[PDB]
Amino acid sequence: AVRPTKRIEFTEADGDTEGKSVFQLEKETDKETFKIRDDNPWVTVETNGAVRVKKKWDYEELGPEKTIDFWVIITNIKYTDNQRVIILVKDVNDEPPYFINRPLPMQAVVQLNAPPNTPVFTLQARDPDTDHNIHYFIVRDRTGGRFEVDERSGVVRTRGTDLFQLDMEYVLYVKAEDQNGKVDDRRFQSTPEERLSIVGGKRAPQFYMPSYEAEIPENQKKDSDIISIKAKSFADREIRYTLKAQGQGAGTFNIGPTSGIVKLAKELDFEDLRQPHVYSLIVTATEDSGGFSTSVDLTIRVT
Ligand SMILES: [Ca+2]
Ligand SMILES: [Ca+2]
Ligand SMILES: [Ca+2]
Ligand SMILES: [Zn+2]
């Protein structure tokens, strides 16, 4: 038999303390013991009907309904009643913002004679709460006032009429704040401090990941697609992709020079001791509109 469902409201912050009791289910008789029907990540049920925080409540990790929804078995006349409990959980601003810029680290060029207020980069941050209010800031300026960032748009502009120097690195350290989420009476939730690299004139291409990793089983099909690798050109020149092995396994793999897709060019057999269980490869992105080239590591482990 079924008891009236218990429906109740809380902020995720009301569940900010492990083992804190948040409410108790009614007893029908005093002998009654309570057992949760299924282990729950968020709550424990005590034998007397008390409900406690298990893992700290987190609105961001709950599913679409944003509830902790569970059944409880109530044993004792000799009866075994069932009762459902639904805890509606309310969002509080409690998660820090993060940068969504890619690739990382943040990189850019600046033309040698950029007029003042030339837009050079756009900081882009998100924040997990429903209630965010993001502000962008330079925190370390190692450039002598050559750049500023718009507090709201994230746009990074040049200041001053002075020339910029070819192949010189202008470095800024930036961050975003969610000014709807305090840590104290002073400070707000923050991204990490990111280093923004601005080079005068031009610079080599950059990969979308600082290094690449793939794990495949030993029965992987020949010629099948393993992983996709992409580099960006700062002057939108054409990129040609190229691959090579550090030690063991030349020819085991190859890359489409335009797609940047890596395929398995040979059969894998763990019985064949000549074949390593870990491949160290180097992918190279060459600007084949003359000159600039960049490399990255590709590690492929086999199981
Ligand atoms: Ca949270
Ligand atoms: Ca939240
Ligand atoms: Ca936040
Ligand atoms: Zn939003």
Q: How far is 127 from 93, CA to CA, in rounded Å? A: 9
Query: What type of residue sits at position 222?
Result: K
Residue 221: Cβ within 10 Å count: 11
Per the CB < 8 A criterion, the answer to whether 70 and 37 are in contact is: yes
**DSSP character at residue 117:** T
What are 89's strand-pairing partners?
10
CA of 132 to the centre of ligand 2 (A): 9
> What Cα–Cα distance (Å) separates residue 172 from each residue in 120, 123, 134, 196, 239?
12, 12, 19, 5, 28
Strands (E) across 12-151 are located at 21-24, 33-36, 43-45, 50-53, 67-75, 80-90, 98-99, 107-110, 119-122, 125-126, 134-141, 147-149
Q: How far is 34 from 3, CA to CA, in rounded Å? A: 13
CA of 129 to the centre of ligand 3 (A): 5
DSSP conformation letters of 216-268: E-TTPPTT-EEEE--EE-TT---EEEEEEESSS-SSSEEE-TTT-EEEE-S--
Residue written as tokens 């944003």?
66
- CATH number of the domain within which 164 lies: 2.60.40.60
Per the CB < 8 A criterion, the answer to whether 18 and 59 are in contact is: no
Per the CB < 8 A criterion, the answer to whether 191 and 181 are in contact is: no
Strand 80-90, strand 67-75: pairing: antiparallel
Q: Do residues 121 and 86 share a domain?
A: no
Per the CB < 8 A criterion, the answer to whether 12 and 94 are in contact is: yes
CA of 70 to the centre of ligand 1 (A): 20
Identify the nearest ligand to the CA of 95 by its number: 3
Which residue, among 89, 72, 76, 62, has the nearest Cα to 8 in the 3D structure? 89
Q: Do residues 103 and 156 share a domain?
A: yes
Q: How far is 101 from 108, CA to CA, in rounded Å? A: 12
CA of 134 to the centre of ligand 3 (A): 9
Given 62, 90, 118, the domain boundary residue is 90
Per the CB < 8 A criterion, the answer to whether 229 and 214 are in contact is: no
Neighbour-count burial for 130-145, b at 16+ CB within 10 Å, e otherwise: eebebbbebeebebee
Q: How far is 187 from 189, CA to CA, in rounded Å? A: 7
Q: How far is 255 from 230, CA to CA, in rounded Å? A: 11
Q: Do residues 81 and 100 share a domain?
A: no
Given 38, 72, 90, the domain boundary residue is 90
Q: Do residues 185 and 254 share a domain?
A: no
CA of 188 to the centre of ligand 1 (A): 15
* CA–CA–CA angle 123, 129, 132 (5° rounding): 55
Identify the nearest ligand to the CA of 55 by its number: 1
Q: How many domains does the chain have?
A: 3
Q: How far is 96 from 130, CA to CA, in rounded Å? A: 12
Residue written as tokens 């893992």?
55
Give the residue numbers spanning the domain of 64. Answer: 1-90
CA of 295 to the centre of ligand 2 (A): 40
Q: How far is 28 from 80, CA to CA, in rounded Å? A: 12
**Cα 91 to chain center, whole Å?**
20
Q: Do residues 214 and 187 share a domain?
A: no
**Quoted resolution (Å):** 2.5
Identify the nearest ligand to the CA of 130 by its number: 4
